[PDB]
């Protein structure tokens with residue numbers, strides 16, 4: 327007599343499964359799915375069967391699964407042309423995991439103090455252009471700021487200066503090549519696709535030249551690029567330009583809209599909540615009488631602003647569907663999920679479970695005080711996912727976001743240009759961010 331399996335939601339369309347109801351609003355869909363069917367709930371995108379894993383226990387089984395059980399490969403087939411064949415998430419488990427392990431130390435610890443200064447510098451620089459007052463699209467601001475700081479830190483000064491223009495064009499041409507038909511199709515050829523391919527080729531060209539020029543010279547800059555040059559596999563072999571190029575692109579895509587979206591939300595949430603705006607300004611102003619400048623050591627200790635970021639990430643996790651292929655029958659909360667099926671964690675859903683986050687719809691940074699529960703379940707809060715494939719860039723992200731917010735708020739008053747309740751997540755975007763017309767006003771402080 328066969329074994330307990332997850333409940334399946336009624337079918338919808340025979341060609342399409344539930345994808346149309348899903349695509350309408352993905353957060354609503356997944357919220358409804360869990361509400362009706364619980365922690366482990368099956369639906370079907372097209373032919374494929376997805377099982378939504380929400381709550382502490384189901385989340386745990388997801389993040390703690392071996393790579394042999396849950397494969398993250400097929401999430402990113404859309405990206406494989408951008409990243410490169412046989413490059414991270416297109417490589418074989420062992421080679422993949424070494425490449426990821428090369429990134430980890432490039433994004434924490436030793437280079438973090440340099441990264442801080444670069445980020446602060448870049449924001450200071452952009453602010454000098456600014457009029458005494460005006461009206462900006464906040465999401466355009468944070469997207470610029472994040473790509474300038476990202477690229478300076480991950481790629482190096484060359485890409486901010488000499489290769490500024492060219493890289494800009496390359497990035498959008500790579501960006502544009504993220505079409506959903508690419509994921510759906512094994513397919514690759516189209517007009518926008520050769521533009522995507524030409525851009526990858528040009529970037530690898532530019533990476534190769536810079537390896538050689540840095541080597542011809544003796545400059546030893548601090549960026550992920552440099553550290554990937556200086557890295558090696560366990561057998562002593564080196565990364566190729568193909569591999570360095572893919573790994574750097576993956577890192578920039580990983581961090582760009584995620585950061586920029588989160589930064590935008592931190593400002594919006596503060597701007598519609600004066601009590602927290604006051605707490606954060608107080609902290610920032612205190613920093614400046616304590617350090618006199620934004621410093622790596624000062625960024626490490628900003629509890630009020632950390633806690634705001636954490637709560638913004640609870641209520642606005644920029645990645646809302648983390649997908650895996652099941653490669654081996656595995657069992658979650660006494661139900662069996664067969665190989666061939668897919669399985670996905672849903673931050674935006676699990677973050678809104680009352681038993682984990684009392685009064686889930688309320689914005690409350692004080693959830694994360696030592697008195698109150700933050701990590702106490704390490705698979706509740708999961709904006710950076712979890713387990714072996716937790717965000718590498720989470721420390722980088724936190725410093726970047728803190729740095730940007732300090733400098734902006736220290737120098738500039740802001741206010742929303744539209745009704746507070748009108749700023750909403752656009753759940754239709756591949757990386758969830760605030761809805762695109764997102765106007766804000768500014769005025770030099772004092």
Ligand code: HEM
Pocket residue numbers: 398426429433576577578580581582584585588639643644645648649708709710711712714715716717718719720722723724
């Ligand atoms: C600021 C908000 C950020 C959020 C919410 C975020 C969230 C995530 C999540 C949820 C994953 C795991 C996806 C999965 O398990 O399927 C992930 C992976 C990753 N993130 Fe981020 N990220 C952010 C910023 C960044 C930044 C700034 C970088 C790099 C500069 C970065 C680099 C990465 C990398 C390399 C991975 C892959 C980890 C692996 O699979 O081993 N992230 N991120």
